[PDB]
Design a protein around this motif. Structure first.
Motif, short mmCIF file in Angstrom:
data_model
loop_
_atom_site.label_atom_id
_atom_site.label_comp_id
_atom_site.label_asym_id
_atom_site.label_seq_id
_atom_site.Cartn_x
_atom_site.Cartn_y
_atom_site.Cartn_z
N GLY A 196 14.25 -21.43 -64.48
CA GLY A 196 15.46 -22.06 -63.98
C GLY A 196 15.93 -23.11 -64.96
N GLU A 218 16.06 -23.83 -45.56
CA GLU A 218 17.26 -23.04 -45.34
C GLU A 218 18.49 -23.91 -45.29
OE1 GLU A 218 18.84 -20.17 -44.47
OE2 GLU A 218 20.43 -20.92 -43.17
N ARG A 221 19.04 -24.77 -48.74
CA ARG A 221 19.43 -23.54 -49.40
C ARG A 221 20.90 -23.24 -49.20
NH1 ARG A 221 18.73 -17.53 -48.15
NH2 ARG A 221 17.67 -18.01 -46.18
N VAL A 222 21.30 -22.96 -47.95
CA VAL A 222 22.68 -22.58 -47.69
C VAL A 222 23.63 -23.66 -48.17
CG1 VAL A 222 22.55 -23.50 -45.37
CG2 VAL A 222 24.30 -21.83 -45.93
N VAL A 239 24.42 -22.69 -51.83
CA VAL A 239 25.32 -21.55 -51.95
C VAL A 239 26.75 -21.94 -51.60
CG1 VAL A 239 25.95 -19.40 -50.83
CG2 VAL A 239 23.64 -19.73 -51.67
N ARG A 270 30.73 -20.45 -53.95
CA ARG A 270 30.76 -19.08 -53.46
C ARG A 270 30.77 -18.12 -54.64
NH1 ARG A 270 36.64 -20.01 -51.56
NH2 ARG A 270 36.60 -22.23 -50.96
N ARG A 271 30.05 -17.01 -54.50
CA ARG A 271 29.89 -16.05 -55.58
C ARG A 271 29.40 -16.73 -56.85
NH1 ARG A 271 34.92 -11.67 -55.99
NH2 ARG A 271 35.81 -13.10 -54.44
N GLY A 272 28.10 -16.95 -56.96
CA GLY A 272 27.57 -17.52 -58.18
C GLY A 272 26.12 -17.91 -58.03
N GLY A 273 25.52 -18.21 -59.18
CA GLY A 273 24.19 -18.79 -59.26
C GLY A 273 23.05 -18.02 -58.64
N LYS A 274 21.84 -18.58 -58.74
CA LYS A 274 20.66 -18.06 -58.06
C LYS A 274 19.72 -19.22 -57.79
CE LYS A 274 18.17 -14.53 -56.50
NZ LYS A 274 17.59 -13.54 -57.43
N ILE A 275 19.39 -19.43 -56.53
CA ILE A 275 18.58 -20.57 -56.11
C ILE A 275 17.13 -20.15 -55.99
CG2 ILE A 275 18.16 -22.20 -54.28
CD1 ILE A 275 21.41 -21.42 -53.85
N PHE A 276 16.24 -20.90 -56.61
CA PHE A 276 14.83 -20.56 -56.66
C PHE A 276 14.05 -21.58 -55.84
CE2 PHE A 276 16.46 -18.13 -60.06
CZ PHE A 276 15.66 -17.02 -60.11
N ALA A 294 20.03 -21.89 -61.53
CA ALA A 294 20.60 -21.46 -62.79
C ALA A 294 21.88 -20.70 -62.51
CB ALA A 294 19.62 -20.56 -63.56
N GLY A 295 22.80 -20.73 -63.47
CA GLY A 295 23.98 -19.91 -63.34
C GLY A 295 25.30 -20.62 -63.58
N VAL A 302 23.93 -13.17 -63.09
CA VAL A 302 23.50 -14.36 -63.83
C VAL A 302 22.30 -13.98 -64.67
CG1 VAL A 302 22.13 -16.44 -63.49
CG2 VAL A 302 24.42 -16.31 -62.56
N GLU A 333 24.50 -14.89 -55.66
CA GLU A 333 24.41 -15.13 -54.23
C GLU A 333 25.74 -15.69 -53.74
OE1 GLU A 333 20.80 -17.14 -54.00
OE2 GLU A 333 21.38 -18.83 -55.27
N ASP A 334 26.15 -15.24 -52.55
CA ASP A 334 27.48 -15.51 -52.02
C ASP A 334 27.34 -15.98 -50.57
OD1 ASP A 334 30.67 -14.62 -52.62
OD2 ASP A 334 30.04 -14.63 -50.52
#
Ligand SMILES: [Mg+2]
Ligand SMILES: [Mg+2]
Ligand SMILES: [Mg+2]
Ligand SMILES: [Mg+2]
Ligand SMILES: [Mg+2]
Ligand SMILES: [Mg+2]
Ligand SMILES: [Mg+2]
Ligand SMILES: [Mg+2]
Ligand SMILES: [Mg+2]
Ligand SMILES: [Mg+2]
Ligand SMILES: [Mg+2]
Ligand SMILES: [Mg+2]
Ligand SMILES: [Mg+2]
Ligand SMILES: [Mg+2]
Ligand SMILES: [Mg+2]
Ligand SMILES: [Mg+2]
Ligand SMILES: [Mg+2]
Lengths: 98, 134, 82, 59, 187
Positions: free
Chosen positions: B25, B43, B46-47, B50, B54-60, B102-103, E114, E176-177
RNA sequence: AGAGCACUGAUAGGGCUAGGGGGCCCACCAGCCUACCAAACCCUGUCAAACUCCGAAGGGUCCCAGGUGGAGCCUGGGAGUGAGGGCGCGAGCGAUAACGUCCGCGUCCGAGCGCGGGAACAACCGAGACCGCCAGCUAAGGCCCCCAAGUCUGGGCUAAGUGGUAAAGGAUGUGGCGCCGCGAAGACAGCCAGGAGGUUGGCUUAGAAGCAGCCAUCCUUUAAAGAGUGCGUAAUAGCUCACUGGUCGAGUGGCGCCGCGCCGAAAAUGAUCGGGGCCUAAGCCCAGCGCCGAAGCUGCGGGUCUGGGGGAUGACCCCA
RNA sequence: UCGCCUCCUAAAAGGUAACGGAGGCGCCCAAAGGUCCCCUCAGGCGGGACGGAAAUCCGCCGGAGAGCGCAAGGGUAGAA
RNA sequence: CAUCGAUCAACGGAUAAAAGUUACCCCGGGGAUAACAGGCUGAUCUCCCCCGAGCGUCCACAGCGGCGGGGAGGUUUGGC
RNA sequence: UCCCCCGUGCCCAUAGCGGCGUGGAACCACCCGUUCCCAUUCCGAACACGGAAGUGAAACGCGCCAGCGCCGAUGGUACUGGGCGGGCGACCGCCUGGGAGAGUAGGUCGGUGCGGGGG
């Protein structure tokens, strides 16, 4: 595989570990604790003939002759993987008889 | 899961091994002091990430509630609380890398972790990265 | 305030004094016991032995010692002599 | 070799049991009591054991 | 890249650990010297030097040694280092890590994706004479579901590996969306 | 404890892959892809009282040596006690509440409610009180007044009464550090001038001219303008954003860290660190010498006990 | 719930409490007893008329993950 | 001497042979022990806030504050 | 005293796995036959007897590699006696002794005693 190597090691000492190969038969009298061999009776390492069964019966009579002048009397057999049957009996059955 | 029932507690002793480093990351979140993070702020954190983009990234997420909670219901004293009435929690000590993502750049990610950092009872410090990989 | 009653988890068993009795370098007499244990964790060596419950007891008077046969286990012996 | 001289300025109150029984072995009963012995390392242990109570001088 | 360094001996570690210095040690096949170095000097340099760049130590013995870091004992809790291991290079081969600078923007990023640079560095088999800088990857024809291993790699001259070509290196993952929360908290 | 994933189970990501989900071969009943769910296995990074490939400090036991202590052992006479409690720590329960409880080590009150600091306060701190003396050394803690002892010396810190009790959080409080950008070719702030065409970019609607949403990540005249940083618009037009020039004249901005503070912070008889009151130090950090202080130690005297010693002795005389 | 057994709580000698966390026993074996001798598993891969993920077989890999009557723990194929 | 009759399971076993009610009650003691309150806590309760997904005709903040998070009071239900 | 082979014993994976070459004079194994002793829950597979047509392919011993496996320091750290300090709170810090785990360089395809046979 061997067990009876351990079985005797429970009781006393004086391992008489016999090795039998297809044309050969070697019989020592080896002592642990000190971990040293003694009477190294053999035939294919001695000079005896080659009829197997009736040949073990004489190497068996060698240790007796050889050992009884070394302070020895105490039997303590050591069958290998073998089964006290043919050559091992003849090898043996001369021992105390010697 | 499958596990088996319930478990004692464990005094968060040395603020240590519960600890890591920004692996897979870009930027990540850290723990300034220990706690018992639950399977409901995660969670919630997390949410919250996001929804920033909207529409993007990746949460680890890098912590997991493998611990039982236990509460009794208004009674007295007998047996042990079946509990779980809030579910499961995750043993969290300082130095631990809670989340990392990341993203995006940072102006789009210095906040996503700033936000979710408000969903925690413990103080946090965003980690840039610092290629101190071991 | 009147609530429920009971579970299932209060049974226990009472102690078995599991341990090494005499240690290495202790003078022991004849018959003494050296290892009360579950199984063959320490195995009987020179002048030792066990019946039934894996109980290492000196066959003869002497000193007790430990050697580690790595593979072959752990062995408590007896140095009779003096 | 020089001896070992030890003075005491603290009390064994609020400190454990063995810690006290050493002071008996060293012979410490009172306050500012001076027991001077032979720097043998077996003995040094109990001084190393109560290092905080006793003051150590080298003679 | 040059870098002054010093010696620690019979002292105690936590001492100038406070004052801003940093402990370390060096080792090869026939030498081991406890040593210490400045932190702010180590922190100025290592940030881009990392476990790769040419590392030189100009000890007060006048000596100047090309070496490398190989272990960073960071202070777990409190984001700061604490101790470094130093390998004395010479000429014999050595394993080390090399950056994997990916080039371009892939295809799967377009319709949602990504890059996840799984391993930015690879353990290799090489010689200190040959110090590569990076191993480019034309990652671009990769889509949401196309990965890249150690097999898919063009290696520089004189360099070979010690990992496995059945490993992984990088991947483009779906994003993710918010439309997919239905697949989550309510199910 | 710790740490680790080699056993037991748990887990995020990726990977290859038994099975199944979409889609064709639309059926011999198999097959290929797959931002799908998924185990076998691997790497990345992990969780654990009933997991340990490892593993302590410490703990117990025998030998040797010091150790004569109201040590230890043996025999017998006699009892009492067998509800305990506090604090520090390691756990369980409990809500990582309870001046709640059940355990382990140790400590102390009980039996030391006898003394000194903690305003007061059985067990927090010091320290074992045989008695006497208007004698000296000290521990805790303290040194402006009640209240005995420096308004002591040097160096910093804070303007709230922080001190003299509480958070997640906000900040233009203050000081110290480090990392850099700008600037004599003239920089930060102010002031004056300019701030546009392609272009109402593409999808989008009653509408989208930059200011609804999505998307990429253009060309210029000019010394200098970016598919526009806000307001404003319904869309607009209007201002102002950075950016260029002149003015101008001795400097400036940004990131993070720590040392101390601000707010957050609302309760019931009357309010207050104990009170007054405090380079407002009598507060916090550091360094130094000095001083007060308890029945602890020392000084002299008296009593009594154990043991040794003097006497060919009752007693008395000595010393621990 | 009251007796007895196994693991943790049991803070690395023994032992340790709580209406703490998890599980068992009140049986049994003329062979499951002793002596002498022969043999050594589960699982996986791949072939094999039945059956079929899993039937008896075979080649390889396979150090204990099987088994040892019953709960659990220790032990153990250099056998129990 | 060898051996037999045990949920003497309340399992160191008072007898071989044993269940309840009392508010018509009494006695000896116990806050070593429950209700009313005094005390600790503050899970719930009341109030308060932090971020900010969104509502609000365009716009997070006129007023509203999802999922979460931290606090004050000790007025409720409770725990000791 | 040394080298090979055989029996064997110890230190217990710096011996193990896998691969590669060698060894056949003696050694031992494979191998021929089951008439007799013995034997297989069928079977000379194994145990066993008699033995010289064939061989070192198997199995076995010996030398090389380091992929797996194992061994693995120094250094530093967690932790902890013991004394002490800070926060009401979860917890943290100082000193003196002890000192890990894992990770690094590195090492490793064993070492040794007795007897017997052949060099
Ligand atoms: Mg036993
Ligand atoms: Mg150091
Ligand atoms: Mg632990
Ligand atoms: Mg003695
Ligand atoms: Mg007082
Ligand atoms: Mg006195
Ligand atoms: Mg005064
Ligand atoms: Mg108010
Ligand atoms: Mg009042
Ligand atoms: Mg049997
Ligand atoms: Mg079995
Ligand atoms: Mg009874
Ligand atoms: Mg009536
Ligand atoms: Mg009640
Ligand atoms: Mg905020
Ligand atoms: Mg809300
Ligand atoms: Mg020759």
């Amino acid at each position: 595989k061997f067990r009876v190597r351990n079985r005797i090691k429970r009781t006393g000492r004086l391992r008489l570990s016999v090795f039998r190969s297809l044309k050969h038969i070697y019989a020592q009298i080896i002592d642990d604790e000190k971990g040293v061999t003694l009477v190294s009776a053999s035939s294919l390492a001695l000079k005896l003939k080659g009829n197997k069964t009736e040949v073990a019966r004489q190497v068996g009579r060698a240790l007796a002759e050889k050992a009884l002048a070394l302070g020895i009397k105490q039997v303590a057999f050591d069958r290998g993987p073998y089964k006290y049957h043919g050559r091992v009996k003849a090898l043996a059955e001369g021992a105390r008889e010697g | 899961r499958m596990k088996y029932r319930k478990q004692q507690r464990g005094r968060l002793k040395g603020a240590t091994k519960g600890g890591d480093y920004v692996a897979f990351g870009d930027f990540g979140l850290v723990a300034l002091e220990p706690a018992w993070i639950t399977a409901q702020q995660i969670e919630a954190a997390r949410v919250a990430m996001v929804r920033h983009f909207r529409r993007g990234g990746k949460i680890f997420i890098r912590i997991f509630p493998d611990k039982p909670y236990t509460k009794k219901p208004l009674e007295v004293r007998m047996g042990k609380g079946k509990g779980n009435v809030e579910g499961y929690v995750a043993v969290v000590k300082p130095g631990r890398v809670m989340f990392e993502v990341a993203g995006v750049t940072e102006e789009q990610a210095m906040e996503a972790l700033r936000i979710a950092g408000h969903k925690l009872p413990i103080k946090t410090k965003i980690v840039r990265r610092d290629a101190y990989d071991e | 305030k009147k609530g429920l009653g009971s579970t299932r988890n209060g049974r226990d068993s009472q102690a078995k004094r599991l341990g090494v009795k005499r240690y290495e370098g202790q003078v022991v007499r004849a018959g003494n016991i050296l290892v009360r244990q579950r199984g063959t964790r320490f195995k009987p060596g020179k002048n030792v032995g066990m019946g039934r419950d894996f109980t290492l007891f000196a066959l003869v008077d002497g000193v007790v010692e430990f050697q580690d046969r790595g593979r072959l286990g752990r062995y408590v012996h007896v140095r009779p002599l003096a | 070799m020089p001896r070992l001289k030890v003075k005491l300025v603290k009390s064994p109150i609020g400190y454990p049991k063995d810690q006290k029984a050493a002071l008996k072995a060293l012979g410490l009963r009172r306050l500012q009591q001076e027991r001077v012995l032979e720097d043998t390392p077996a003995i040094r242990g109990n001084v190393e054991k109560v290092a905080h109570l006793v003051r150590v001088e080298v003679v | 890249y040059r870098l002054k360094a010093y010696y620690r001996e019979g002292e105690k570690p936590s001492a100038l650990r406070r004052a801003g210095k940093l402990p370390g040690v060096m080792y090869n096949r026939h030498l081991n010297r406890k040593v210490y170095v400045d932190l702010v000097e180590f922190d100025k340099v290592f940030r881009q030097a990392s476990i790769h760049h040419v590392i030189v130590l100009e000890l007060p013995d006048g000596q100047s040694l090309p070496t490398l870091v190989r272990q960073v004992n960071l202070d777990k809790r409190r984001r700061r280092p604490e101790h470094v291991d130093f390998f004395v290079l010479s000429d014999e081969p050595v394993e080390m890590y090399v950056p994997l600078r990916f080039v371009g923007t892939p295809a799967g990023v377009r319709a949602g994706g990504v890059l996840q640079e799984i391993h930015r560095d690879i353990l290799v088999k090489v010689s200190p004479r040959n110090i590569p800088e990076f191993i480019e990857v034309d990652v671009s024809g990769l889509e949401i579901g196309d990965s890249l291993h150690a097999s898919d790699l063009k290696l520089p001259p004189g360099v070979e590996l010690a990992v496995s070509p059945e490993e992984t290196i990088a991947a483009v993952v779906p994003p993710e969306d918010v439309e997919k929360l239905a697949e989550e908290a309510a199910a």
